[PDB]
Structures are given as structure tokens and as C-alpha cells.
Amino acid sequence: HHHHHHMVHITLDRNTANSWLIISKDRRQVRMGDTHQNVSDNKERFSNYPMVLGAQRFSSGKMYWEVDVTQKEAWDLGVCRDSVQRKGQFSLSPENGFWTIWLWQDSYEAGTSPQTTLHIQVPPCQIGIFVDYEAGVVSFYNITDHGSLIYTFSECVFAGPLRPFFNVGFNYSGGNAAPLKLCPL
Numbered sequence: 001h002h003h004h005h006h007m008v009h010i011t012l013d014r015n016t017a018n019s020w021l022i023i024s025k026d027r028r029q030v031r032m033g034d035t036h037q038n039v040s041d042n043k044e045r046f047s048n049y050p051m052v053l054g055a056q057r058f059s060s061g062k063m064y065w066e067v068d069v070t071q072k073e074a075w076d077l078g079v080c081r082d083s084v085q086r087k088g089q090f091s092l093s094p095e096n097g098f099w100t101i102w103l104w105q106d107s108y109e110a111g112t113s114p115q116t117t118l119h120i121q122v123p124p125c126q127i128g129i130f131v132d133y134e135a136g137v138v139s140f141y142n143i144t145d146h147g148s149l150i151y152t153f154s155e156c157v158f159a160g161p162l163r164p165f166f167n168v169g170f171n172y173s174g175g176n177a178a179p180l181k182l183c184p185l
């Protein structure tokens with residue numbers, strides 16, 4: 001791809017984080033803590049899952065950023081509506097305002113309803129995310145494999161401002177403590 005020139009500097013929004021997340025001082029890294037992180041509750045926080053939003057809101061144009069997923073067993077990445085549900089149980093789907101991919105149990109899947117199997121030959125250590133607001137496109141790229149396409153959501157009905165979306169995943173196994181990191185431009 002040749003999307004790198006629409007690069008945007010994403011930072012994480014502490015106020016949206018599940019209360020067990022630890023966001024770095026530079027707001028570019030997030031990991032699951034081994035307990036509640038001593039913050040007050042608020043209506044923005046994702047309650048049921050280890051999720052957080054980027055601070056930036058996008059309502060036009062082309063945007064591109066990259067995320068490091070090295071040595072994680074589970075995660076979700078993409079974009080979502082600013083108005084997505086925060087509390088209780090929900091599925092990641094375009095109907096619920098999410099355009100995402102994930103790793104779970106040694107398989108990669110796109111967050112369609114029902115979910116779509118991804119075909120990845122080279123497990124990615126860094127993921128590129130491209131949004132074209134006007135075109136209604138969200139695309140994912142394998143930076144480890146020379147930028148190869150992972151998945152394109154097209155005919156997207158955003159229906160609102162978009163925010164970068166992250167899930168560090170559960171760490172029941174003890175093998176998923178590693179952070180998500182926003183990679184430099």
C-alpha cells in the first residue's frame with residue numbers, strides 16, 4: 001500500500017479505559033494491570049472488557065496509524081463510532097458501530113456478524129489501519145509481511161465521528177500481558 005503519507009499521531013484517552021488498564025505517560029502504550037488501577041468510575045469507561053479509545057475523533061479524510069502487537073495471544077484493533085455502548089456485554093460488529101479485526105486462540109478474524117476467517121501466512125508483529133471516511137473504507141495491513149492486505153471493510157455506514165479502538169485482551173493464561181503500542185511515524 002501507499003497509505004503511509006496519511007499518518008496521524010494517535011494518543012489514548014485515559015477516561016475511556018477499563019479501570020484495570022495502565023496507559024503510559026506518553027499515552028502511546030496500554031497494558032492490562034494485575035488489579036483495579038485506582039481510578040474513579042465514569043460513563044465513558046468500557047466495563048466488561050479491557051478496551052480503550054484514542055483521543056482523536058475523525059469525521060472526514062484519510063487517516064493511517066500502526067499498532068505493535070508483538071508476543072500477544074489476544075487483542076482487538078480498529079475504529080468505532082464515538083457513541084458505541086460502554087457498559088455490559090456486546091459483540092464487535094458494524095451493526096454495533098465497530099470496524100475491527102482480532103486475534104483469539106491462534107486464529108485471526110474480522111469483526112463482521114458473523115465473524116470472517118482471515119488468511120494470514122506471516123503472524124503480524126505490527127498492524128496498519130487505514131480509514132477513508134468519505135469512501136466508507138477501513139483496511140488492515142500486515143507491516144511484518146511488507147504491508148500485505150489483511151482485510152477491507154467497504155460500504156461502511158459510520159453514522160458518526162470515529163475513534164481509534166483497542167482491546168488488550170484477557171490475561172487468564174498469563175501469556176497475554178504484553179502491551180499494545182502505537183508505533184512512531
Ligand SMILES: Cc1c(Cl)cccc1NC(=O)[C@@H]1CCCO1
Nearest residue numbers: 018020047048049050170171172
Ligand atoms: C480486566 C478484565 C476484564 Cl475487563 C474482563 C475480563 C477479564 C479481565 N481480567 C483478566 O483478563 C485477568 C485474568 C483474571 C485477572 O485479570
